[PDB]
Amino acid sequence: QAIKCVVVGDGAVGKTCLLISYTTNAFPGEYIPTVFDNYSANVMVDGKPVNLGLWDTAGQEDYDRLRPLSYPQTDVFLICFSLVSPASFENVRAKWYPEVRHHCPNTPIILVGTKLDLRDDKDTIEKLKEKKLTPITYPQGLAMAKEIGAVKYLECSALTQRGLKTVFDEAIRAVL
Numbered sequence: 001q002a003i004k005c006v007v008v009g010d011g012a013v014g015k016t017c018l019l020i021s022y023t024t025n026a027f028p029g030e031y032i033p034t035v036f037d038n039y040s041a042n043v044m045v046d047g048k049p050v051n052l053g054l055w056d057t058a059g060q061e062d063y064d065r066l067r068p069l070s071y072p073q074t075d076v077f078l079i080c081f082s083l084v085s086p087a088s089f090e091n092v093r094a095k096w097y098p099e100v101r102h103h104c105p106n107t108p109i110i111l112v113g114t115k116l117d118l119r120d121d122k123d124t125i126e127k128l129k130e131k132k133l134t135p136i137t138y139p140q141g142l143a144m145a146k147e148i149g150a151v152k153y154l155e156c157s158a159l160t161q162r163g164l165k166t167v168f169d170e171a172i173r174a175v176l
């Protein structure tokens with residue numbers, strides 16, 4: 001079964017790394033901003049084989065009139081935000097949930113907190129502290145998910161791969 005999955009979210013949240021770590025079991029060298037890339041993976045979820053078409057989108061605001069072109073016939077959306085960027089988190093409800101629902105009213109949304117490894121990280125906590133900012137907790141993620149009518153909230157690290165397979169397993173489970 002062919003399943004189309006589109007990934008959106010603010011620039012630098014870890015969309016590309018998420019997709020490349022999942023499909024190749026390797027974390028990308030540098031940070032090259034995505035224009036548009038196309039990945040695929042053969043998955044087995046609950047006894048079913050699936051062709052998972054993964055569509056990587058640009059998080060830069062410049063591509064606002066270009067991004068909705070990826071949206072038709074989408075089976076499941078991943079809206080991504082960094083657990084370590086409150087700003088990216090606020091934009092889940094301010095930008096990404098509205099943009100997805102204006103074009104795809106019904107398509108299931110999975111909300112995905114990325115960079116889980118960085119949540120308990122010393123340098124990062126302290127760097128957010130100096131701006132009177134704090135990492136996004138799990139309860140807040142779940143409330144945001146309910147807020148945007150997401151079908152699942154999941155947390156993962158593209159770096160350690162912690163929670164990474166479940167993201168896509170649940171993405172497929174929201175279509176099936």
Ligand SMILES: Nc1nc2c(ncn2[C@@H]2O[C@H](COP(=O)(O)OP(=O)(O)NP(=O)(O)O)[C@@H](O)[C@H]2O)c(=O)[nH]1
Nearest residue numbers: 011012013014015016017033034059115157158159
């Ligand atoms: N610690 C940590 N860093 C991560 C993780 N995922 C991505 N990063 C870092 O975050 C930066 C952005 O990653 P990237 O996947 O390119 O984000 P993006 O959402 O694709 N950006 P764009 O919208 O511009 O394409 C990179 O420096 C990358 O190494 C993660 O799970 N943990």
Ligand SMILES: [Mg+2]
Nearest residue numbers: 015016033034
């Ligand atoms: Mg990218």
